[model samples]
Target: GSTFGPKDIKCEAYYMQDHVKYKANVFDRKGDMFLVSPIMAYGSFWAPVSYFTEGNTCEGVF
Candidate 1:
């Protein structure tokens, strides 16, 4: 398994409700990483949909 600390986390830019939104990176046990876009309303707060590799052009998110 792979482990990551706070230094491994980062935020990226997105769009939501005509405003700029942000998404995060996903780290797995195999040392692979992914990013998920799309901010959804969860009762009151906003949350991302799921981890995906599609449309990601950057080398690293963190």
Candidate 2:
């Protein structure tokens, strides 16, 4: 319980199952939040942070 970093969370299941739909980017972080942006849903964007952090919510390679 002393891990201070990011977590590669499988969001698809979190979406398709409990959330809905899936697929997105690790929308980056804010010091400790793995910001997540949904492809079809942005209202409930999730950025599960750390002890519990890492990943960055980035715009698609545009």
Candidate 3:
């Protein structure tokens, strides 16, 4: 059976702030990849950010 996961995932963390940013390309070996949109978080809560998905490319900014 095929599987799905993230590829080339990259992230940046702030040294003096409570924030982090991430982006990646998602893929599924069986077929198309379904992503739940890009997101960012701090602590235990997700912070709002502008993001979008195109094909296997997923990106987020916060």
Candidate 4:
């Protein structure tokens, strides 16, 4: 597993980085391509949810 850097955090205002921006690195890309960790919370929520990739085949809190 890898750790998250500042780039991994999303900007709330303009939807862009406030400083240097980094695209998903190899590990980050790999992470997105894998099943989210088993800790992800599940169930219906007010927020709409959707899955668009093979990596999202499973559900988790992450």
TM-score of each: 0.21, 0.29, 0.17, 0.14
Could you say which candidate leads in lDDT? 2
Q: Write the per-residue lDDT of candidate 3 for residues 1-62, one digit (tens) a residue.
A: 21242333322221212353344322212123232223333223232212322122233411
Which candidate wins on TM-score?
Answer: 2
User: Where's the lowest-lDDT run of ten residues in candidate 2?
Assistant: 53-62
Model 1, range 1-62, lDDT digits (tens) per residue? 21243234333333344464444433222234333323342222223323432332233433
Better of 1 and 2 by TM-score: 2
Off by over 4 Å in 3: 1-18, 29-62
Output the TM-score of candidate 2.
Answer: 0.29
- Model 2: residues with Cα > 4 Å off, grouped in runs: 1-21, 40-46, 49-62
Per-candidate count of clashing residue pairs (backbone under 3 Å): 0, 12, 0, 5
Q: Candidate 1: deviation at residue 2, Å? A: 17
Error of 3 at 27 (Å): 0.8
1-62 per-residue lDDT for model 4 (tens digits): 21343232221111114664322211112322422221123321221112222122122234
Candidate 4 CA-lDDT value: 0.23
Error of 4 at 28 (Å): 2.8
Off by over 4 Å in 1: 1-6, 10-13, 28-62
Q: How accurate is candidate 1 locally (lDDT)?
A: 0.33
Each candidate: what lDDT? Answer: 0.33, 0.39, 0.27, 0.23
List the candidate numbers ranked by TM-score, top first.
Answer: 2, 1, 3, 4
- Model 2 Cα lDDT, one tens digit per residue, 15-59: 333445444444345555455555443454546533222332232
